[PDB]
């Protein structure tokens, strides 16, 4: 099925690999190459994820774990039951990323749209694979990765924290989230003002940029103007994954010790050492 | 039977075959490496007397 | 009976034929040799202490 | 579009090559079983 | 009872 | 025959063919809402949202940016369009929409929207001619006229807008095709 | 498309041939597998 | 049987093919390189009776 | 699109190409169950 | 027999056949190697 | 496309005799093999 | 052969096969350059028989 | 895109810079073989 | 017999026939050098 | 691709140069029978 | 010697001294990194005197 | 715009700067290894 | 013969056997030196006691 | 632009020359080293 | 024979030949420095006790 | 580039350099024989 | 653009700021050496 207007835009073309082989539509869903190799991943990746849960203690939903590896391998592929299962999920699932990626720059490509999607995308793949690529490697063993399950991937991130003493006091951590608060109060007052300007009190007439202008003027006092929010947004949302990239590259792999003691430079500065 | 050529284009139906016959066969072959019994990759030169079998506990 | 054939490529028809032959002889062998102790003898006869 | 002539002309191949595969799985089964039981 |  | 396009073959998730050039037509991403409203946007007041500024006389160029005006345009095969004559303001929010274009290979002035505009070395330094990667300069001739040049509709907004955006895939014939 | 009935009347002479010429071979292989290691 | 390529383009398979080969050949080579049989960098050197099997 | 004497031509390249792939990758397992037989 | 080949192109007879014998014959070595203790007699000759 | 039943009638009379030059160089392994070491 | 040249663009197969080689030529020295007999940043001085091998299989 | 002479030259090229680089990765095992052989 | 060369071309099949020898050339001297206890004796021959 | 008028030519050394190959390997042969027989 | 017509010498020409450059920067880092080549505070050791990796232990 | 004089020009620049580097490292591998070995 | 060489060039040839020469000759040089023991006596003759 | 039957006739000379030559100097080196270190 | 020198340039031809000698010389010699013990004799004759 | 009268004289110089080179690294073997003989 | 003559004008400056900028390093590093050497 179709949308009303849509059937002139689903023509041939803007494809990056492939050409005409799969540019089509399954239903709603535009295909393409990406598409191919995204379905593979998916399907290959969540049936090990299924394949994890069948060998683990418990069907229960919260409490399937699909562990990384012990330290001791390294950078090897451990046993499949030792967590090797889990690094082939990874593979899967960097390829099922990717493979979103380059779809959707396909599908903007055809419809003549800027390549913004893809790359705001980018930005949270970058945190996925800075936990489970990049900071493991620097590390030096695959085990420093999250393990795969709803609640055990939080145990995970209370004890890497706790690695750290204090991990509140992270620099770049207290950025990164930063961010994200800023980003929700953002995203609260964009959809608040779009929507009281076209959805007013009854009998009022239809609101305009002029007003949502001046209104905005008054709770910042600045007009940011409505390109200017939309930039604002996306380098909001954005930023908060790569401080938050940077924020857990940075512990362990540069530094080791608590977080609290590393504002000791601060304490230390010649004016008032 | 040949009226499924008809239905679906079968540029697609077969890819979406090559695709679900690869996405099984290397589940099923990563399912055995997963198992004792099937590790072949460390433990394929034994003999089916020295291979491993799987049981409950004795219950005593 | 020959009419059997009218609807077909002759070289479908010898690829599946071929195909069914090939699959059957391995398989009787694969299962004869651990029915009937060959090369196994044959083995054991020319192996060293 | 292709015709009912063509589909059926395809299907031909389609099967011998669906058949084809069975027969090299099967084998690949007997060789397995020979080796290694599961039943 | 560790084992059969 | 005046259908824009038909399927490229029966199956249900086909893509469909243009009949002719996809650009003029509008046809995929040259297409546009063409049922949309062909009426000037207004200001809150009820003055025409988008003029060329040489109609209001409160707006101008702030001191520190280039202006674009007697810059020359070079299109998509790096050839020499025309050059700028006259920036169209949104008088809402202040804002340059459009540039419009005196073409050198004619007589036409055409409408150029800003976000088909690249600065060169995005805009650091030169800041001397205006990019524009989606058309070539022989396509600039049917950029989409208005019935006036003082005012601009929706529906023209939405065809002028379109038909840039078409070029992206339609300029040249290698810019459909895969890079591998 | 496929055979007539005239190329099928003289293709199913030559599958009658092959497919009996194979029998005999296997007719002689399982006579000397008898006299070798008989199996009931 | 050659009319497989007057579905699919072949200059748009064999890109796919090479692709898809090249991965399987290098996930088959790490999943034996890191199995303690077939760890051929560190103990290639062995000897097939000398090389580990994974009974236990 | 292509004809099918282009399709006939590439389709020979493309069994020659993909069996003698296959003929180089028997002899490397040949050389590998040599060195180190796994069954 | 003979018009069985109709229809065929024969370089890609060659192929097949060449790369069947190829996988057969090596198949058949290593199987008779192992079973006819050869060249496995042939070595302990020449060890030392 | 492919062979005519000519070039196809021409093409089986050399493929038939290399068959039988391969079976006759097997058979000659073969016996020289059964000299040498007999399986049965 | 040549013809391969004219279903693909010269140009960028050269850059598909160097960036190839430069990445698996950079895995290999590094997978060589981690392990233990081949650290030859450190070890490469060791003679043939003392570098490290990794361990047998047990006597039983 | 090119022609079939054009294409011509430049596979003699290709084809010896791919025998050259694999004269001297030959070269290169061979020594790594004669320091620390790894079979 | 001859004919077969038709529509080849004779700078592929050299380019084949070639890399085959070389081919097999190694594999067989490195399974023979296995077998037969050489250069094994002649390193044994000069050594210290 | 070659005429048969090549092929002829070309098959008349193709096999000259394979006898002679085959000569060659005979020689071979004989001096390592006669240097360490293998039967 | 065509290649030149397919890439702008204005690009290869830092392209290629990137590459160089990056190269070297990190052969050097990872000799640096090293025990036997940290040759910033070891330098003056005697090739007997600088450190050699651990060996098989034959037991 | 390039002509095959401003090519052939370049790349005997270029070939002989990259060989010249070569030398030059070359003899820096030299000195490396006399105060050094790494074999 | 010399019909082999018809269509090729001067300067691929020498390069595609230059190539091959340097490579094969000092594999087999690199393979000699290890099993006749030189220079490895050589540098036993010389070597400071 | 290829090799000429004329040129690789020339070259073909020349080709045979220095591979003849080529070989006469490594059957001299082997003499050589035969003397100083049997290997059979 | 001097054919094979044209569509060359001789500037080219003396680099590499040039750059050829210097690397195989300087190998000759590290090397044969190795195997000869020399100048390793030279410094032990000098050196002081 | 170079044309054959060019590489005419080309080759004869040529020679003779390498011919030179050749003669003086007969020399430093001779010496060197004398000095430290290797066989 | 740029002229030859510039260019060639330009290059001596180069030269000769490049060789002061090299003398003064090549003392600094003597004297560090002389100060405490690395090798
Ligand atoms: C954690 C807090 C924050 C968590 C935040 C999570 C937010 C999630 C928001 C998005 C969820 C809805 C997605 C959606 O609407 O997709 C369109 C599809 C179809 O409707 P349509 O688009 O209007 O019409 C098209 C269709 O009628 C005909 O299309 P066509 O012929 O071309 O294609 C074939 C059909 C076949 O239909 C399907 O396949 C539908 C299968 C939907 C399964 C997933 C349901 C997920 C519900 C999640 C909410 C909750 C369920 C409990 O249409 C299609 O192919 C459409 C494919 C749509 C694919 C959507 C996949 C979304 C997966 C989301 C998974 C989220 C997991 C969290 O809709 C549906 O089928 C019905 C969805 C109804 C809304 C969910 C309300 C659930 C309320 C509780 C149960 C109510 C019971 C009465
Ligand atoms: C015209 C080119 C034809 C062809 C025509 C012939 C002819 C004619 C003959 C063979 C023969 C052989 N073919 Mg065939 N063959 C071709 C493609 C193949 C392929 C393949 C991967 O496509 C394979 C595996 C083979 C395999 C084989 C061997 C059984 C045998 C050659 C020795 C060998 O061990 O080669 C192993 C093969 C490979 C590793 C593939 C690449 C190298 C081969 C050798 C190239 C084939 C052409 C070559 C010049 C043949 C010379 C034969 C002499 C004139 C006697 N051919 C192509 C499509 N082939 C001969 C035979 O039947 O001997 C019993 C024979 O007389
Ligand atoms: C445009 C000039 C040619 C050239 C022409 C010559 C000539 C002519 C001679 C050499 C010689 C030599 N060349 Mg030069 N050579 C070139 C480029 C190079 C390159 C390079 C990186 O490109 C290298 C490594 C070499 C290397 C070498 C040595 C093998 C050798 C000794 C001098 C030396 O070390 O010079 C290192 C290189 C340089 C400093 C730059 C090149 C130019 C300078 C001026 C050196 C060579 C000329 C030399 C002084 C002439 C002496 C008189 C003659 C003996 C009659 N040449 C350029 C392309 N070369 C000599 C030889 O063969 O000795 C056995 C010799 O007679
Ligand atoms: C272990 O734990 C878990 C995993 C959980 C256990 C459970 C597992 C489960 C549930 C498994 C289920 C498996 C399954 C279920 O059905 C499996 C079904 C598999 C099937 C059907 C396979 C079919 C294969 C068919 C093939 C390969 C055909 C190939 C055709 C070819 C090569 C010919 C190409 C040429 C053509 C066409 C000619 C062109 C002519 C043209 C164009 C012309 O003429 O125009
Ligand atoms: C160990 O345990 C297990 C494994 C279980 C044990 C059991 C094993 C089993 C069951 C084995 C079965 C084996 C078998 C069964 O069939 C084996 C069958 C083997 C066969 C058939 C071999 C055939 C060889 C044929 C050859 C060499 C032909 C060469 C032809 C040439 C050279 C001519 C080429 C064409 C020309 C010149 C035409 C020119 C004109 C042209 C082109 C024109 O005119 O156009
Ligand atoms: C840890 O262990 C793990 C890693 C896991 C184990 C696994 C390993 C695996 C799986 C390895 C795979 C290896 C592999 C494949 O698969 C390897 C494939 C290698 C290949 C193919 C290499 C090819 C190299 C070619 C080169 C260098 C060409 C050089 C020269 C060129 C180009 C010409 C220059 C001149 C030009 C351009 C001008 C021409 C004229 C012109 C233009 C004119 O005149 O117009
Ligand atoms: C250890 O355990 C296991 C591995 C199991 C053990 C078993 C191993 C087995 C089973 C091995 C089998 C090997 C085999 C099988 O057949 C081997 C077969 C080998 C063959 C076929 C060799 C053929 C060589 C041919 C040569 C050298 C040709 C030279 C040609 C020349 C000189 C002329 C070139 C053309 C010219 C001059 C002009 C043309 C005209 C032109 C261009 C014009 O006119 O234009
Ligand atoms: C340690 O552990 C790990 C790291 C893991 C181990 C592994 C390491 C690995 C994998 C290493 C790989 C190395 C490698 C691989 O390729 C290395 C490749 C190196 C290369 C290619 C070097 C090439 C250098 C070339 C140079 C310097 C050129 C200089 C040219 C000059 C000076 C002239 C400039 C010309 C001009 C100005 C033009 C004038 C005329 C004009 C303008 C006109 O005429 O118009
Ligand atoms: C230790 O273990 C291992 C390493 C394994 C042991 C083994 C080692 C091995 C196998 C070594 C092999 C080495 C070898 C093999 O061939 C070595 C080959 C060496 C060669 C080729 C030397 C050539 C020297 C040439 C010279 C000096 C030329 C001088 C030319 C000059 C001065 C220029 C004159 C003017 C000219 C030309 C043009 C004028 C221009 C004109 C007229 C114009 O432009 O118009
Ligand atoms: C310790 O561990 C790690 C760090 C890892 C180890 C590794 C380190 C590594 C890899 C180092 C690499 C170093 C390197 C590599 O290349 C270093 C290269 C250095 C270089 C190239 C230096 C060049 C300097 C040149 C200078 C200063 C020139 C000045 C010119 C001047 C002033 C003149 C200006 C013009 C004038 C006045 C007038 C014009 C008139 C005009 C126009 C008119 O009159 O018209
Ligand atoms: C389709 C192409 C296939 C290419 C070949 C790829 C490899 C597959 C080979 C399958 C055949 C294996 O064949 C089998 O080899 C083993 C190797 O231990 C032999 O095993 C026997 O000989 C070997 C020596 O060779 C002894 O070390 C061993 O103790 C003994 O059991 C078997 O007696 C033989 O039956
Ligand atoms: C190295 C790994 C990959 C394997 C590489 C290939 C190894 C085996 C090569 C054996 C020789 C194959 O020989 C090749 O056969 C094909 C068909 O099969 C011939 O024929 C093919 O091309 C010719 C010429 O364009 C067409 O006329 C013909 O219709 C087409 O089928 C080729 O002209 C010949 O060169
Ligand atoms: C292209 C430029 C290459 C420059 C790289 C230089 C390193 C490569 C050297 C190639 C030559 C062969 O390698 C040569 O081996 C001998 C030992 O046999 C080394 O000899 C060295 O190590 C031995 C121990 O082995 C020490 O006792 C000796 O004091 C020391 O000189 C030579 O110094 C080295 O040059």
């Not at chain 1, 069907?59 to 774990?65: C, F």
């Not at chain 6, 988008?50 to 070079?74: C, E, N, Q, Y």
């Not at chain 6, 600065?119 to 208005?146: C, E, H, M, R, Y």
Request: net charge neutral; hydrophobic share 45%.
């Amino acid at each position: 099925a179709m949308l009303s207007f849509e059937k002139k835009y689903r023509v041939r073309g803007g494809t990056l690999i492939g050409g005409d082989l799969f540019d089509f539509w399954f239903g709603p869903f535009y295909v393409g190459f990406f598409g191919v190799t995204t379905i593979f991943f998916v399907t290959l990746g969540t049936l090990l994820c299924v394949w994890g849960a069948a060998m683990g203690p418990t069907w229960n939903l919260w409490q399937i774990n699909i562990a990384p590896p012990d330290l001791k391998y390294g950078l090897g592929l451990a046993p499949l039951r030792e967590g090797g299962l889990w690094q082939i999920i990874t593979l899967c699932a960097l390829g099922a990323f990717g493979s979103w990626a380059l779809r959707q720059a396909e599908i903007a490509r055809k419809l003549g749209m800027g390549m913004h999607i893809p790359w705001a995308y980018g930005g949270a793949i970058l945190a996925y694979t800075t936990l489970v690529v990049i900071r493991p490697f620097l590390l030096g063993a695959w085990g420093h990765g999250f393990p795969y399950g709803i609640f055990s991937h939080l145990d995970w991130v209370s004890n890497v924290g706790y690695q750290y003493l204090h991990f509140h006091y992270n620099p770049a951590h207290m950025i990164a989230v930063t961010f994200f608060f800023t980003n929700c109060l953002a995203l609260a007052m964009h959809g608040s003002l779009i929507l009281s300007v076209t959805n007013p009190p009854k009998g009022t007439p239809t609101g305009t940029s002029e007003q949502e202008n001046v209104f905005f003027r008054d709770l910042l006092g600045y007009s940011i103007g409505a390109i200017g929010i939309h930039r604002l947004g996306l380098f909001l949302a954005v930023g908060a994954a790569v401080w938050s990239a940077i924020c857990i590259v940075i512990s362990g792999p540069f530094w080791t010790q608590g977080w609290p003691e590393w504002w000791n430079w601060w304490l230390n500065l010649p004016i008032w050492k | 039977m040949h009226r499924i050529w008809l239905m679906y284009d079968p540029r697609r139906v077969m890819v979406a075959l090559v695709g679900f016959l690869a996405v099984l066969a290397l589940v099923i072959h990563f399912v055995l490496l997963s198992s004792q019994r099937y590790s072949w990759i460390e433990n394929g030169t034994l003999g089916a007397d020295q291979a491993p079998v799987g049981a409950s506990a004795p219950a005593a | 009976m020959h009419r059997i054939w009218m609807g077909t490529d002759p070289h479908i028809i010898m690829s599946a034929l071929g195909s069914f032959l090939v699959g059957a002889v391995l398989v009787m062998h694969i299962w004869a040799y651990g029915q009937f102790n060959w090369p196994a003898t044959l083995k054991a006869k020319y192996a060293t202490p | 579009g292709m015709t009912e002539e063509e589909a059926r002309r395809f299907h031909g191949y389609m099967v011998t090559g669906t058949l084809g595969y069975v027969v090299v799985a099967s084998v690949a089964h007997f060789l397995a079983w020979s080796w290694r039981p599961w039943f | 009872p560790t084992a059969w | 025959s005046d259908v824009k396009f038909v399927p490229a073959d029966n199956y249900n998730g086909s893509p469909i063919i243009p009949t002719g050039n996809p650009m003029i037509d509008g046809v995929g991403p040259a297409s546009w809402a063409e049922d949309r409203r062909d009426e000037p946007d207004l200001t809150y007041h009820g003055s025409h949202k988008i003029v060329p500024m040489r109609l209001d006389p409160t707006f101008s160029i702030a001191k520190g940016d280039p202006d674009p005006r007697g810059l020359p345009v070079i299109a998509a095969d790096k050839q020499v369009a025309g050059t700028v004559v006259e920036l169209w303001v949104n008088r809402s929010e202040p804002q340059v929409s459009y540039y419009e274009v005196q073409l050198a290979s004619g007589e036409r002035r055409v409408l150029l929207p800003t976000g088909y505009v690249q600065w060169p070395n995005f805009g650091l330094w030169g800041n001397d001619k205006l990019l524009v990667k989606s058309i070539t300069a022989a396509q600039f001739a049917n950029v989409p006229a208005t019935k006036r040049d003082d005012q601009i509709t929706l529906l023209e907004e939405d065809k002028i807008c379109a038909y840039y955006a078409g070029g992206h895939m339609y300029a040249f014939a290698e810019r459909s095709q895969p890079i591998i």
